[PDB]
A paper describes a structure:
The proteasome is a proteolytic enzyme complex essential for protein homeostasis in mammalian cells and protozoan parasites like Trichomonas vaginalis (Tv), the cause of the most common, non-viral sexually transmitted disease. The 20S core particle forms a cylindrical structure consisting of four stacked rings, comprised of two inner rings of seven different β subunits and two outer rings of seven different α subunits. Importantly, three of the β subunits, β1, β2 and β5, have proteolytic activity and are therefore responsible for protein degradation. We address this challenge by creating a recombinant protozoan proteasome by expressing all seven α and seven β subunits of Tv20S alongside the Ump-1 chaperone in insect cells.
Residue numbers in the entry:
A (entry chain K): 1 to 191
B (entry chain F): 4 to 200, 206 to 233
C (entry chain G): 5 to 234
D (entry chain C): 2 to 199, 203 to 239
E (entry chain A): 2 to 240
F (entry chain B): 3 to 231
G (entry chain H): 1 to 204
H (entry chain E): 9 to 129, 134 to 246
The structure:
């Protein structure tokens, strides 16, 4: 039930994730990077058990690199999104990966995909996995404008994360936000 | 020659020439001698030293508490057969809780060697085993052949120069049943001495009550006289 | 002569299975073993031409237990002989597992001839250079399987060296008219007459399955007939 | 055993798999197949192996569609060609199922060449005695034409030939092939090269024209008998 | 890989399966001839029972076997191959009865044996089973008699009259030159034994031939006891 | 271990086992196929081993499905195995797709199986060439499937004993405009040309696909009716 | 279900009811619960109908397999049938709730083996199984004699299975009799009109 | 013949003898056991100066206590030493102790002769590598010799490779049971230098000691190899 | 499955199949891998029909972001080696999260070739591979040459394929112990040019800088370096 929130802009994607890793009632770390950079172009925020998320992220990143090396071409964001969807569809039926993801990738066009452990793939302008969607979707609906600037995008993502902090009972102690744009995945701070 | 292709090929004379080649590989091993008294059984052999400063390659092996085998031929195949025999002893001491009879071990190793000679892509074990056991069956000596058969003996010699040992055993065959453990060991060492081309001779001795034990080098000095 | 003699599954242009014929040659090389059905039971006698005087007296069996009612005389390649003996024991055990009853020599012979035939029918196998005479008084059956896998019930079977003369001599006696204890001297005389002088030391490994044995296989006791000869 | 084994997955004293060299020779005994890349597509042409007054030219024999963006001409054993075309179609559709994207041409060529190579390195089976001219389009590398071998070796070619008189066709292409050609120009080039190397009946020839358009996408059309006849009569 | 066309079951340069023809000659090596005649009212199969040595129990020297109660099989060939084929036809029959729930027809059993002989003639690691099989019986669905021959090649056919063994050519010639739509089971048996006796060129006794005469009354397979065989032989010695 | 391929390329790129299977076809009994405008025909000279053979029990012309039919030339047992496989493929196609397997799909499945047996180890190629008739959208279709697994499409062809002479006869006496009756007459005349002695309706099996697009084996009465004319 | 196989001096009488029950509904009112495994070997079936029919067909397969390599097809066939019934029940004890009484005639004479749902096979002179057999246990004990002939045992088995039919809801319909002697097996059906007793025996 | 597991009419596994020949075609290696330790001196064949000598290491540390030097096919020897390393770590895992030198030697030997052909899916040919396994077990250095046949023998001194026979002949009158580790290193390097076709140098030789005092199999550095080659009489 | 032990020893002790795989390598295009303190450079000569084919089919491959790979020999056996090497690099990342050591991946490729020399029914890879790259765990650029025999050796500058002996002589002559990155480029380029009579239109040169990925030299910089070397 970890809070990962994606926000797609005209030429960027702000992908944020709960940075607090936990063991039972203990917050083991306050800066755990739950967003997985499968490629230099794609950051996969993952909500789920830390072990399942780590193993799935490593598998997907290894497969993306293997596709890049086997064939001298990098996966697209639609191709990678559907590869993740195929992986999750295989898993659910046999040996399920219990991870709900937001795949944010920039391959010349911004892309944000709502993915879940079952394998529902949907390109979204904004979304979230965990209970944070119940808190952030409305704010996006209330404040997202087409053609949103990157600064307005950071403001809107900050608003969504602040809503997670304020209204979600299990408030993440912090978030790690990453900007996925033509320059790649860069970790940022929203203040 | 032209039918010496596989262990699966019969020559027009009914002979498996690859089986005969493996049997010769056994006949090229160092002299191995086995004896059997009414109370004890003995296997002895001049261990092979490939180099001057190399030790003598072990030749006597303890399969179970009252079972041992002396290999003659490819020592690697001998070790594989020793592994198989120890597995058989461990599955007979698991299924039944008692020690297997050396006759049953001879049956199993003969079956394995025959299956090696009956299916293509397999070679006969290039090693012949002088197995001595003691138990409810009494002391028993079996010379297992690569072909997939074991011959029960009161005494036997295999490997190189084994005709002299066989002659000695034939001369003293009727003495062996009443020969004590010490006398059977002495007969073994004096059948090997006729094959001499001691620190090379290793001898495993077993008895109905005495568990199989391996004596090598100076330990056998007391049995020379 | 031609190249049709290397592959067991290969047929000669005359329809001959040369590898099977060489397995039969291996059988013919071995010292004769025979079986006779008698009033009181069936007697299996195997001639053991002891290559070395050091061989254990009464050891190196050629007659084997297959079941508490079935014995197996063996001729030919002794590795193949005991392989078929153990495969017959396994076939009897599997038959008991599948059907509960104890196997009969006719269908035991059929099941083991199945392996005999598979040896020269599918590649990657060597034909069994052994003839196995399964005897059972409780089944009144004496079925001999040949290296090809051909198995026949016999009134008096025999295979090995001098097998033709041994069968001709077995033909001279109506074995069912007599019991096993009086059959033993006759069979012993037959084998001694055919025993080759070159083999000085030898033995007659006799077994019988009779009422005196309650139908169980049993080596003919030494007191009844000392198997060992010089 | 192995007395009657041909060592299909075994090297020769020269270092070349003699079964792959014999498969290549079999291809050289097969009907000529020519591929030519033009601006936004690739034209494949081939000579039917079955060409008689009675043979009914119902469907393409040497030409096969692998996907909406990939077509293949083949020289060599048409049966092995059908088997590998089925495998290539299954692989392209597997890649479409996995990635919701049309399989890149180089990756399908690498898949068929991995199959053909595996037959030359493992299992002691007969190699696929076929050479594919795999024309196709992918976003990554535009329109491509690959020449595969029974060894499992492939190479992109602007224009190439395989089969009987493949060297003559290659020389004719080298003398005549231009870059950034049009569909009509490349098709006429293929007609000229076939006519010189190869008789010459239109129904004996097969044509397929991969063409990438920004609007429709990558479209593969294997020219029908009427289209082939109309195209050849124009020379 | 050249040279396997004569030692393995692969086609030769002339397109022949030499191993199949050699399995035919191995069938000829059985030293025994079978003749089967089918009539609207019965099917009689007589196969000479040549026991080479009288030490052998003759009841075990059989070329006629019970595949099912309704389907018999007169198998001429190598005795080992004959036993393999009896066990493989019985396995076919049992598998068919377990799946389809009814006893295997002679036609389907012949098809399955032909399929096995085709796997033998194609799989180079399997010897062509040298058994010419005469399957026969009364098919219930048609309530009519079936008589099929499956050669070692697997070439299976339905026959009004068929023959196997050493005199297969001569027996088939005599059968076709004298085949009739017999009106009695005993006329079918007489023709069967007469053709077999004539082609074998030796007088027969019940000891010297196994005869199974499946009639509409006795549809179930059974080798005729020596009484009925001798009666048929006397009927054949009448004329 | 016999997993090695016995069909291998020779020094010159000639699959000797394929040529051997083709020779087996060439000595496997003449079978003709003729594609008419409104149908297709496949006949064969099914001369039995003896007059005692029952024809129905080993019919060479067989049904693959309601719309597709097959005749062969070559090893009869190989044809029976391929026929069982093709019928099983057709019923599988019906199970998965509710319709009989298309004619070219049946041909491609037979070709795939034969190629498989020409490539996998421990086996020989099927020694039969199959003439498969059936209707596609554009009309009737006749298809030759060789042991190699290569499948021609023919308007007419013979591929059995004396098939070169019969194919020359078809080249000389075939026209597209022939009807199904004309195609049957052409097939029977081709069989007569390549058969020694008088041809009989008993000795040939004919299977036709007609306007109904359903494959039907002509009964001996119908074959005799055609022969008399 | 009422199964009652009696090994007589001159044959085997296998009596059964004909009522297949799905709860209180009778899907089949004329059930052949005694399956002809072989012409002289029959299997009276109780417990799950599907499991018992699979058992019958599998035992037909196993007995034909017994005949693959032998010619004495009528030898030990009933004992082998009981053994295979028992090995299938113990092998599939988790999935097969089947009890079978296999009775008939073979080379060994008349035989009746009761393999229980647990997979316990016992050669029985008098064997009964099924829910209805409980109601007639005392009746059998009072009216069964070892010396009964096949006709006497047939009458007694009809009476006992009729009593079980009357007192058991799971047992009903007609009394399927099978009389197996050396000559063969004769099937009979005792319809409710021809049954010796009626529901009127209840309360006198 | 024509199959790997075939016996010559002389009773020899032909592939085994040919693998022995392959070992005789490999680089020389002398193993000298002395009560202080077992010393390997190995000819590193350098086809060029560009060849990184440390990467053609014919000496492999199977474990802390046991090491191995190869002769013959370097790749088959790599497989053998990989198996030996897995066996040594498995033994430490299963019995909380260093694997015996004889034990790991026997394990790799059992692996050696497990080659086969003709059976459905194993290695297809014998290892063309002979190993000189040596290490410290129970405060004692043990030196073993494995050859492709799968037979292993404990050795006080042994030689494997091209100069194996000549090296053994030189060791005949040069090897004694009470030598110091200094003397053992000197003898190993002298025998190697004698049985190689190039002047001995620290870069073309690989020296390693299973040292009892340290109880560990270490591989000597260039400095130690120079420290030994300097002392040699030539 | 098929197990015909393609690779067997000969009486003289040679694996003739390995000799034939080496011959296949020696008929492949020349590859020259050289290293500097901080950069590795690979130069493969290319034989092609410049007017009729795309020169984008490269012998140099990237097993990982730190492992560069070139080959000489059969392009299909090399493709299989490169595919397995890329899979192994990603599997090493999966199992360890650390970039696979250049020695580790070179050992893996050599072990693939070795297994093909050891696995029955498997044809030895007719490819010699130059596995180059950088290890952060060692701070050393590495260039290993894996052979068809399955033996891998690190080199300061190694060449494979046709003309490998001439290029080896050139490398030995013109190698400096402490070359700069551009000096390594010049050595590799000149060594390849020693056997090639064509410039940038033929040669293909890639390189990997310290802590960098594989970059293919342009057709402008390559030609400039070629002219500078001359
Ligand atoms: C009897 O056992 C019974 C019947 O369905 C019966 C089953 C075996 C033979 C076929 C018909 N099994 C049942 O589940 C019910 C409940 C008790 O008796 C049944 C009627």
């Amino acid at each position: 039930m970890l809070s990962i929130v994606g926000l797609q802009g005209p030429d960027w994607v702000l992908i944020a994730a709960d940075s607090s890793v936990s063991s039972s009632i203990i917050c083991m770390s306050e800066n755990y990077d739950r967003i997985a950079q499968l490629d230099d172009r794609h950051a996969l925020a993952m909500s789920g058990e830390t072990g399942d998320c780590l193993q799935l992220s490593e598998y997907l990143q290894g497969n993306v690199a293997l596709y890049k090396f086997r064939n001298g071409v990098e996966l697209s964001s639609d191709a990678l999104a559907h590869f993740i969807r195929h992986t999750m569809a295989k898993a659910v039926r046999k040996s399920p990966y219990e991870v709900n993801m937001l795949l944010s990738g920039y391959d010349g066009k911004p892309h944000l995909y709502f993915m879940d452990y079952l394998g529902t793939l949907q390109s979204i302008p904004y979304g979230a996995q965990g209970y944070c969607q119940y808190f952030v979707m409305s704010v996006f609906d209330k404040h997202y404008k087409e053609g949103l600037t990157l600064e307005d995008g950071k403001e809107l993502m900050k608003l969504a994360l602040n809503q997670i902090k304020q209204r979600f009972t299990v408030a993440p102690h912090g978030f790690i936000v990453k900007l996925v744009d033509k320059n790649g995945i860069t970790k940022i701070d929203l203040e | 020659s032209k039918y010496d292709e596989n262990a699966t090929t019969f020559s027009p004379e009914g002979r498996i020439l690859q089986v005969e080649n493996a049997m010769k590989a056994v006949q090229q091993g160092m002299p191995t001698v086995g004896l059997k008294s009414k109370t004890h059984a003995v296997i002895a052999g001049v261990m092979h030293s490939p180099s001057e400063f190399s030790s003598h390659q072990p030749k006597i092996f303890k399969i179970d508490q009252h079972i041992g085998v002396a290999i003659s031929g490819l020592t690697a195949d001998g070790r594989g057969l020793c592994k198989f025999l120890r597995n058989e002893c461990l599955h007979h001491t698991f299924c039944f809780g008692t020690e297997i009879r050396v006759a049953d071990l001879a049956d199993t190793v003969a079956l394995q060697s025959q299956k090696k000679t009956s299916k293509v892509g397999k070679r006969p074990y290039g090693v012949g085993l002088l197995m001595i056991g003691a138990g409810v069956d009494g002391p028993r000596l079996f010379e297992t052949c690569p072909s997939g058969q074991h011959w029960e003996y009161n005494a036997q010699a295999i490997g190189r120069r084994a005709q002299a040992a066989k002659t000695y055993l034939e001369t003293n065959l009727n003495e062996f049943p009443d020969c004590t453990r010490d006398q059977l060991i002495r007969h073994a060492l004096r059948a090997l001495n006729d094959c001499k081309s001691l620190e090379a001779i290793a001898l495993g001795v077993v008895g109905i009550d005495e568990p199989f034990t391996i004596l090598e080098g100076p330990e056998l000095q007391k049995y020379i006289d | 002569g031609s190249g049709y003699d290397f592959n067991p599954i290969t047929f000669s242009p005359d329809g001959r299975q040369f590898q099977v014929e060489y397995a039969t040659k291996a059988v013919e090389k071995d010292s004769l073993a025979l079986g006779v059905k008698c009033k009181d039971g069936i007697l299996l006698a195997a001639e053991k031409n002891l290559t070395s005087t050091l061989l254990t007296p009464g050891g190196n069996p050629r007659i084997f237990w297959i079941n508490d009612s079935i014995a197996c005389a063996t001729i030919g390649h002794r590795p193949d002989c005991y392989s078929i003996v153990e495969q017959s024991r396994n076939r009897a055990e599997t038959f008991t597992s599948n059907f509960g009853i104890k196997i009969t020599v006719p269908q035991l012979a059929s099941e083991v001839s199945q392996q005999f035939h598979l040896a020269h029918y599918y590649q990657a196998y060597r034909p069994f250079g052994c003839t196995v005479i399964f005897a059972s008084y409780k089944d009144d059956a004496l079925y001999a399987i040949e290296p090809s896998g051909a198995f026949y019930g016999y009134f008096a079977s025999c295979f090995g060296k001098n097998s033709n003369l041994a069968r001709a001599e077995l033909q001279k006696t109506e074995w069912k008219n007599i019991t096993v204890r009086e059959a033993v001297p006759e069979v012993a005389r037959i084998i001694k007459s055919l025993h080759e002088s070159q083999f000085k030391k030898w033995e007659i490994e006799m077994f019988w399955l009779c009422e005196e044995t309650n139908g169980r296989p049993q080596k003919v006791p030494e007191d009844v007939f000392q198997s060992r000869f010089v | 055993t192995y007395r009657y084994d041909a060592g299909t997955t075994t090297f020769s004293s020269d270092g070349r798999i003699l079964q792959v060299e014999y498969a290549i020779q079999s291809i050289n005994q097969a009907g000529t197949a020519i591929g030519v890349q033009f601006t936004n597509g690739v034209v494949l042409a081939a000579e039917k192996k079955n060409t008689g007054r009675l043979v009914d030219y119902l469907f393409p024999e040497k030409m096969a569609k692998i996907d909406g963006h990939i077509v293949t001409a083949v020289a060599g054993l048409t049966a092995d060609a059908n088997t590998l075309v089925d495998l290539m179609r299954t692989s392209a559709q597997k890649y479409l199922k996995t990635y919701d994207e049309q399989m890149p041409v180089e990756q399908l060529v690498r898949m068929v060449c991995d199959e053909k190579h595996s037959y030359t390195q493992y299992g002691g089976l007969r190699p696929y005695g076929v050479s594919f001219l795999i024309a196709g389009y992918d976003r990554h590398k535009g329109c491509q034409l690959y020449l595969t071998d029974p060894s499992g070796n492939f190479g992109g070619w602007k224009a190439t030939a395989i089969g009987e008189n493949n060297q003559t066709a290659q020389s004719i292409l080298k003398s005549q092939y231009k870059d950034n050609m049009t569909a009509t120009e490349a098709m006429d080039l293929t007609v000229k090269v076939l006519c010189k190397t190869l008789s010459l009946s239109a129904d004996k020839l097969e044509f397929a024209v991969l063409q990438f358009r920004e609007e429709y996408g990558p479209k593969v059309r294997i020219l029908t008998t009427s289209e082939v006849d109309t195209l050849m009569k124009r020379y | 890989s050249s040279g396997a066309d004569r030692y393995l079951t692969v086609f030769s340069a002339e397109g022949r399966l030499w191993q199949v023809e050699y399995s035919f000659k191995a069938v000829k090596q059985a030293e025994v001839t079978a003749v089967a005649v089918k009539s609207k009212n019965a099917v009689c199969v007589a196969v000479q029972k040549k026991v080479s040595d009288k030490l052998i129990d003759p009841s075990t020297v059989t070329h006629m076997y019970r595949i099912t109660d309704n389907v018999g099989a007169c198998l001429v060939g190598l005795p080992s191959d004959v036993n393999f084929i009896v066990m493989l036809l019985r396995s076919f029959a049992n598998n068919f009865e377990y799946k389809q729930g009814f006893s295997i027809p002679v036609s389907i059993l012949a098809q399955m044996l032909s399929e096995r002989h085709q796997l033998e003639s194609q799989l180079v690691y399997v010897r062509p089973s040298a058994v010419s099989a005469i399957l026969f019986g009364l098919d219930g669905p048609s309530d009519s008699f079936a008589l099929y021959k499956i050669e070692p090649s697997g070439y299976s056919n339905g026959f009004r009259a068929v023959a196997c063994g050493v005199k297969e050519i001569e027996a088939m010639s005599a059968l076709e030159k004298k085949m009739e739509d017999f009106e009695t089971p005993e006329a079918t048996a007489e023709f069967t034994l007469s053709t077999l006796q004539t082609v074998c060129g030796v007088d027969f006794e019940a000891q010297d031939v196994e005869v199974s005469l499946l009639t509409r009354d006795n549809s179930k397979f059974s080798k005729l006891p020596n009484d009925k065989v001798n009666e048929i032989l006397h009927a054949v010695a009448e004329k | 271990d016999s997993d090695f391929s016995l069909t291998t390329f020779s020094s010159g790129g000639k699959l000797n086992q394929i040529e051997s299977a083709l020779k087996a076809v060439s000595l496997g009994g003449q079978c003709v196929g003729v594609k008419a405008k409104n149908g297709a025909v496949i006949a064969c000279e099914s001369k039995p081993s003896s007059p005692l053979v029952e024809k129905v029990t080993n019919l060479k012309v067989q049904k693959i499905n309601d719309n597709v039919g097959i005749v062969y030339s070559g090893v009869n047992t190989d044809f029976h195995v391929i026929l069982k496989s093709l019928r099983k493929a057709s019923i599988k196609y019906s199970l998965r797709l509710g319709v009989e397997m298309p004619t070219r799909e049946v041909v491609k499945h037979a070709a795939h199986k034969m190629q498989y047996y020409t490539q996998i180890g421990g086996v020989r190629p099927f020694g039969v060439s199959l003439l498969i008739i059936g209707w596609e959208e554009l009309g009737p279709t006749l298809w030759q499937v060789d042991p190699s697994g290569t499948f021609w499409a023919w308007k007419a062809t013979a591929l059995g004993k004396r098939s070169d002479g019969s194919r020359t006869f078809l080249e000389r006496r075939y026209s597209e405009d022939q009807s199904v009756d004309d195609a049957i007459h052409t097939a029977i005349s081709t069989l007569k040309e390549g058969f020694d002695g008088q041809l009989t309706a008993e000795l040939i099996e004919i299977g036709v696909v007609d306007e109904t697009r359903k494959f039907r084996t002509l009964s001996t009465a119908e074959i005799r009716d055609f022969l008399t004319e | 279900t009422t199964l009652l196989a009696i090994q007589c001096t001159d044959g085997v009488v296998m009596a059964s009811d004909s009522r297949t029950s799905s709860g209180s509904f009778i899907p089949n009112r004329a059930t052949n619960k005694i399956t002809e495994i072989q012409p002289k070997i029959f299997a009276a079936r109780c417990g799950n109908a599907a499991d018992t029919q699979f058992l019958a067909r599998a035992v037909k397969n196993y007995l034909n397999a017994l005949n693959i390599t032998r010619e004495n097809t009528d030898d030990s066939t009933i004992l082998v049938a009981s053994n295979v019934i028992r090995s299938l029940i113990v092998r599939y004890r988790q999935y097969l709730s089947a009890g079978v009484i296999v009775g008939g005639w073979d080379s060994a004479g008349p035989q009746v083996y009761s393999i229980e749902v647990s997979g316990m096979a016992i050669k029985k002179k008098i064997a009964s199984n099924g829910s209805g057999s409980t109601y007639i246990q005392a009746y059998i004990d009072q009216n069964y004699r070892e010396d009964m002939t096949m006709e006497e045992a047939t009458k007694f088995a009809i009476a006992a299975v009729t009593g079980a039919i009357i007192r058991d809801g799971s047992s009903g319909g007609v009394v399927n009799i099978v009389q197996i002697n050396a000559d063969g097996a004769k099937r009979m059906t005792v319809r409710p009109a021809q049954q010796p007793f009626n529901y009127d025996i209840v309360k006198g | 013949d024509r199959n790997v597991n075939t016996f010559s009419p002389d009773g020899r596994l032909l592939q085994v003898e040919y693998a022995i020949e392959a070992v005789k075609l490999g680089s020389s290696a002398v193993a000298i056991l002395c009560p202080e330790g077992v010393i390997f001196a190995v000819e590193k064949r350098l086809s060029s100066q560009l060849l990184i000598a440390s990467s053609v290491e014919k000496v492999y540390a199977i474990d802390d206590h046991v090491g191995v030097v190869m002769a013959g096919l370097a790749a088959d020897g790599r497989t053998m030493v990989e198996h030996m390393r897995v066996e040594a770590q498995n033994h430490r895992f299963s019995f909380d102790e260093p694997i015996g030198i004889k034990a790991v030697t026997q394990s790799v030997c059992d692996l050696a002769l497990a080659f086969g052909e003709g059976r459905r899916k194993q290695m297809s040919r014998p290892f063309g590598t002979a190993l000189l396994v040596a290490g410290i077990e129970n405060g004692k250095c043990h030196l073993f010799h494995t050859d492709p046949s799968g037979t292993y023998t404990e050795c006080r001194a042994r030689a494997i490779g091209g100069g194996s026979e000549g090296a053994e002949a030189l060791l005949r009158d040069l090897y004694k049971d009470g030598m110091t580790l200094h003397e053992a290193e000197d003898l190993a390097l002298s025998t190697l230098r004698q049985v190689i076709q190039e002047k001995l140098n620290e870069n073309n030789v690989e020296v390693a000691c299973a040292r009892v005092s340290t109880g560990k199999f270490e591989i000597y550095t260039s400095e130690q190899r120079q420290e030994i080659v300097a002392r040699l009489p030539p | 499955d098929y197990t015909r032990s393609i690779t067997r020893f000969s009486p003289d002790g040679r694996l003739f199949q390995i000799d034939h795989a080496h011959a296949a390598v020696q008929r492949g295009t020349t590859v020259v891998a050289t290293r500097s303190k901080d950069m590795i450079v690979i130069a493969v000569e290319k034989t092609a029909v410049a007017k009729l084919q795309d020169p984008h089919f490269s012998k140099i491959c990237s097993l990982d972001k730190h492992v560069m790979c070139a080959f000489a020999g059969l392009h299909a056996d090399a493709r299989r080696l490169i595919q397995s090497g890329q899979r192994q690099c990603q599997s090493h990342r999966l199992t360890y999260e650390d970039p696979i050591s250049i020695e580790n991946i070179a050992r893996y490729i050599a072990t693939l070739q070795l297994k093909n020399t050891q696995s029955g029914g498997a044809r030895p890879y007719g490819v010699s591979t130059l596995i180059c790259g950088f290890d952060d765990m060692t701070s050393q650029p590495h260039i290993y040459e894996t052979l068809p025999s399955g033996t891998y050796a690190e080199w300061k500058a190694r060449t494979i394929g046709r003309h490998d002996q001439t290029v080896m002589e050139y490398l030995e002559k013109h190698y400096k112990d402490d070359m700069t990155d551009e000096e390594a480029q010049k050595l590799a380029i000149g060594a390849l040019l020693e056997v090639v009579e064509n410039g940038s239109k033929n040669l293909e040169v890639a390189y990997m800088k310290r802590g960098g990925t594989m970059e293919i030299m342009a057709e402008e910089v390559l030609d400039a370096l070629i002219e500078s070397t001359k």
